[PDB]
Amino acid sequence: ADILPANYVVKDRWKVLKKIGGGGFGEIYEAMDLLTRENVALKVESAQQPKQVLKMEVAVLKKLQGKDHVCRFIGCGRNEKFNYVVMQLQGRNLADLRRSQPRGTFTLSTTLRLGKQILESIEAIHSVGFLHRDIKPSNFAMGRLPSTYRKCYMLDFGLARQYTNTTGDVRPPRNVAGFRGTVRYASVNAHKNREMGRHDDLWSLFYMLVEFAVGQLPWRKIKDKEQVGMIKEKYEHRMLLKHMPSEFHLFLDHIASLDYFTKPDYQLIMSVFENSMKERGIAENEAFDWEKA
Ligand SMILES: CC(C)(O)C#Cc1ccc2[nH]c3c(c2c1)-c1nc(N)ncc1CCC3
């Protein structure tokens, strides 16, 4: 029931090696580029699929070309059986890398430097008029080249939504919007089925970095969406920072001040990470936790 069988060739050029990801809305393959001779990521959507989402993912990926933390766009197309996009192949995701660490915790020096890169990628997608709406560790992957192995890449625009109109204006929010993303790193706004904003992507970043540094979130054992929302709604969030750098209280306070309409202060949040590093003498050139160094 896979859309492409192994050794299937797309457009006489990309040869399927194996499936590397799957879900309701399509599949991702590692393929060999019979022209450039590197391997690539080949993401496919069944032609017959009711909700056609790939066309928007490709539009977002093309808008982001030239930005750091973005896969290179190789090709796309359309035929009677499937839509596809070919993109740069990336490596290990941050969820797998976090689980591989002894206590499921990154050093502050890894956490803060990933934070800078993820924040850059969030501002980037926001700058072309889209919300990601499923910011989570498994959607960020480290590079797999000498030129990219300390670079973090933003994946999966499958749940993204344009928050501007044709003419650059902020769109009206729907009075109710069904939150369809991952429970653990969802904002209290998303839990309430409110229209998501730029601030909700930065809430997801906040929860990710607490989990990175501390090794857990208070609700991690609870999978039910409506229970997790009720736990978050009451949780004293300044408790989450007990063992985090104090400069995180600026980040929390800022994103708590934001609504759907307000452009976030990305530079305020960047300065939290940069001041946290400077305080501790963390350098940018440091080993990540998962490297031999
Ligand atoms: C078109 C766009 C940007 O929206 C997308 C997307 C995308 C969704 C789901 C995915 N699952 C995986 C990947 C992936 C990508 C993946 N992608 C890449 N390029 N390298 C490596 C991997 C790791 C293997 C698993």
Numbering used by the authors: 21 to 313
Q: From the publication, what sentences describe this entry?
A:
Our lead (AMG28) emerged from examination of the off-target activity of a published Amgen NF-κB inducing kinase (NIK) inhibitor. The potency of AMG28 was reported in the MRC Kinase Profiling Inhibitor Database as 8% activity remaining for TTBK1 and 12% activity remaining for TTBK2 when screened at 1 μM. Biogen evaluated AMG28 in a biochemical assay (TTBK1 IC50 = 199 nM) and a cellular assay that measures inhibition of tau phosphorylation at Ser422 (IC50 = 1.85 μM). The aminopyrimidine ring makes two key hydrogen bonds with TTBK1 backbone hinge residues Q108 and Q110. Except for AMG28, which was equipotent on both kinases, all analogs were more potent inhibitors of TTBK2 than TTBK1. The enzymatic data for this small series supports that the seven-membered ring offers enhanced efficacy versus the smaller and larger ring systems. We propose that the ring system size alters the orientation and trajectory of the alkyne and the ability of the compounds to make key contacts with the back pocket is diminished with analogs 1 and 2 compared to AMG28. All inhibitors, including AMG28, that protrude into the back pocket produce remarkably higher Tm shift values than TTBK inhibitors that are unable to access the back pocket, including those built upon the AZ2 scaffold (ΔTm < 3.5), when tested in parallel.
